[PDB]
């Protein structure tokens, strides 16, 4: 019921469409050139004509049935009821897969070749000799192939210079905050980032304003909220470009004033490119795939964030996580509730090693939440304590409600290791930059 | 022949389904997100389905010829039904095609069940009978079940507060937990005689008086029991007077007065040994579907053992999870209490911490809310010239308090609120009745 070859006959068609997809775009024959060759071709004809392309777009000519009709070799003649089916066929775009697939095609051809030659090679046998024949087809094939291949860098650095010239002509993706940009200079891509705060710090908070640093910059962003639900999330964002307070907005009752910037501000979030994902506990691979996903359905996603992670190793989660950042070529932030070991400290300013089966490594920036009056309130009672044994809050909200706070830059890779001094505002909860 | 019109007519359904993807590669994704390629009559369409979902996730197009070299080359799709693919007329918006074919798929299971089921009545263990109806069920049940997304749930919340939960008993508390919100996971650590059998029971009766169904499971111990200390709430007589037997004429009858009327109430309950997670998942599924009016349920109590050991015999962290499943899915708020560790006291601060639930594959996060009590006298006590100024100052304490009325100064710790804050609240507890006495701020100090 099955006859061989039918499938080629099919095989010979891609041929012919890639082809006209070149007569269409000139500039293609580039890219496929790169990769196909003419004897690579099954169908002679094809091939040949393949050649012609390159002699004719090396001397800068465009490609049709006019200038391929004229530049015929007169050694081979393409027959009348396939030069006519070429340009007859129908235009196809993206034709990149088609490339790649006529590559492997031939590949299977060299197959053939070679795994019926060396056999008989071996027959005749020195036997070491007939091993030496099967390296050397080793290595030929791998060179033959070019998967995943190494070479070469001199090319990518051209482009790669010819891209930060352009915008000399900011390094990565905004942060929000100036004082900490200086350090970071910017989110380069591929690079993981991570920030460990403790809770009710304002973490959650925090995080959406730098969110919407991506957003002004138009930067797609993928959100991941496994422990908290989306709704709340979104909630504290519209508490910042509002200026509204929390409870006010969480509550229900909106005066004339109120709703109408809420309203302004609701649509504006609406059109910007923004994604959620609030199931609970997701696992790791899970992220790899949805975060392939999402990438391959949107190519504009620039930046990741995720909050945030629980303790169960951390070392392994850091690494998957890195290597989709160089994966997906895009800085990937994740959030990070430290253990209690911290405030049994003395000095309970977060330190790179509190969040201890292995400590964390892989993340290239780490940043720190750091309240400095939450602890000095703590402080200020164990010395009542020692008064025993031996009004503010109101004054603080007359002012305006901000407290001093610091962000600790204690990990920079490749950089400046330092600690930037912004001020909080405990309502909106939201770090005012300056 | 009307089994066989629908056969005629799924066959050509899903082809277009399969030509419609062809056209519109994108298209798989909300397909497979419904559809597997097992769900298919026609076999070579199932196979056609998996090719194509081969295809997309090496993100390569999908056409006639993508088909053919990738063929699996353990079957080769016949020419008559792969070409009739392609021919078929291609039309939009097939999402109610795919929930059509999907009806035809789950019918086409249903009857191998059907048979199934049947033929086992040929044995004469009926149990065994039900417990396979109660799987069968299980199954068909779990396998019924961006921006714009979240703007419609964000919309149909605050239609909610327009249209909060259910109350605690304590207004102290219900200014922090706003109320029980449907499908919250809630949970309570508390060590053993503290009065936490005594203390659930007030709450279980806050609900009560607020006429929502509520469901009582009992592992370690006994119903009765549960419904003996409630009745020392209400008709507010001492524990061991209602245990012993004997009461008087104005008790017996503020007994009975308080009998029926709770007797009336929407209550019930589960006393059996060792019941399992999926076991409860079961149970509240049953009970749900037998009283619709039921907010919400209790649990006393899960005891926790870390290891590997514990996860085959019978973890709190996926049993957490399969109840914020259970929660959301019946949409009302679960409450389990919880036995801490020892280690809580080897501590210097004997108040209750997050992380003193630990457990074999991590610790509990997965709750929403998380409540501690903490009773500042009973650990007082045990840690309690100078020897003689303190053997005499303290002396004079112990008679003061037991005259009093045995009223001790008590804490229910807030130490996790999800969106919410974090805070403490003081209660008067009564040692004798075992019983939280509630008032606000204002009132108490």
């Given at each position: 019921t099955m006859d061989h070859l039918k499938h080629l006959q099919q095989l010979q068609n891609i041929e012919r469409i890639v082809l006209s997809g070149i007569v269409l775009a000139n500039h293609k024959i580039e890219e496929v050139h790169s990769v196909l060759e003419p004897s690579d071709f099954y169908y002679p004809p094809n091939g040949l004509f393949f050649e012609i392309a390159l002699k004719l777009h090396e001397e800068d000519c465009p490609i049709d049935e006019n200038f391929i009709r004229q530049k015929m070799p007169k050694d081979k003649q393409i027959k009348e009821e396939d030069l006519v089916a070429i340009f007859a066929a129908s235009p196809i775009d993206n034709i990149e897969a088609y490339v790649e697939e006529i590559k492997n095609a031939s590949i299977k051809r060299k197959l053939f070749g070679l795994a019926n030659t060396i056999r008989e090679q071996a027959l005749e046998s020195k036997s070491s000799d007939i091993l030496g024949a099967v390296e050397r087809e080793v290595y030929a094939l791998l060179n033959g192939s070019t998967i995943e291949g190494f070479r070469n860098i001199k090319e990518v650095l051209e482009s790669a210079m010819d891209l930060i010239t352009e915008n000399q002509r900011v390094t990565g993706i905004p942060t929000g905050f100036v004082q900490l940009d200086n350090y970071t200079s910017g989110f380069n891509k591929?690079?993981?980032?991570?920030?460990?705060?403790?809770?009710?710090?304002?973490?959650?908070?925090?995080?959406?304003?730098?969110?919407?640093?991506?957003?002004?910059?138009?930067?797609?962003?993928?959100?991941?909220?496994?422990?908290?639900?989306?709704?709340?999330?979104?909630?504290?964002?519209?508490?910042?470009?509002?200026?509204?307070?929390?409870?006010?907005?969480?509550?229900?009752?909106?005066?004339?004033?109120?709703?109408?910037?809420?309203?302004?501000?609701?649509?504006?979030?609406?059109?910007?490119?923004?994604?959620?994902?609030?199931?609970?506990?997701?696992?790791?691979?899970?992220?790899?795939?949805?975060?392939?996903?999402?990438?391959?359905?949107?190519?504009?996603?620039?930046?990741?964030?995720?909050?945030?992670?629980?303790?169960?190793?951390?070392?392994?989660?850091?690494?998957?996580?890195?290597?989709?950042?160089?994966?997906?070529?895009?800085?990937?932030?994740?959030?990070?509730?430290?253990?209690?070991?911290?405030?049994?400290?003395?000095?309970?300013?977060?330190?790179?090693?509190?969040?201890?089966?292995?400590?964390?490594?892989?993340?290239?920036?780490?940043?720190?939440?750091?309240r400095g009056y939450i602890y000095q309130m703590r402080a200020e009672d164990n010395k009542i304590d020692k008064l025993k044994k031996e009004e503010e809050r109101r004054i603080h909200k007359q002012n305006g409600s901000i407290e001093e706070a610091e962000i600790i830059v204690a990990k920079n890779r490749n950089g400046a290791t330092g600690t930037v001094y912004t001020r909080f505002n405990a309502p909106f909860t939201r770090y005012e930059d300056m």
């Open positions: 591929g690079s993981l980032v991570i920030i460990g705060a403790r809770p009710s710090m304002g973490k959650t908070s925090l995080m959406m304003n730098m969110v919407l640093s991506a957003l002004n910059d138009d930067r797609g962003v993928a959100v991941f909220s496994l422990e908290m639900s989306a709704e709340q999330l979104a909630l504290r964002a519209l508490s910042d470009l509002t200026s509204i307070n929390m409870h006010d907005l969480e509550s229900g009752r909106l005066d004339d004033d109120q709703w109408e910037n809420l309203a302004k501000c609701f649509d504006h979030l609406s059109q910007k490119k923004l994604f959620f994902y609030d199931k609970s506990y997701v696992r790791i691979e899970q992220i790899r795939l949805q975060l392939r996903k999402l990438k391959s359905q949107h190519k504009e996603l620039g930046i990741a964030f995720i909050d945030y992670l629980q303790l169960m190793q951390i070392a392994e989660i850091s690494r998957e996580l890195k290597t989709l950042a160089r994966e997906l070529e895009i800085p990937i932030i994740a959030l990070v509730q430290l253990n209690r070991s911290l405030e049994n400290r003395d000095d309970k300013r977060p330190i790179l090693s509190d969040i201890k089966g292995g400590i964390e490594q892989d993340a290239d920036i780490v940043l720190f939440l750091y």
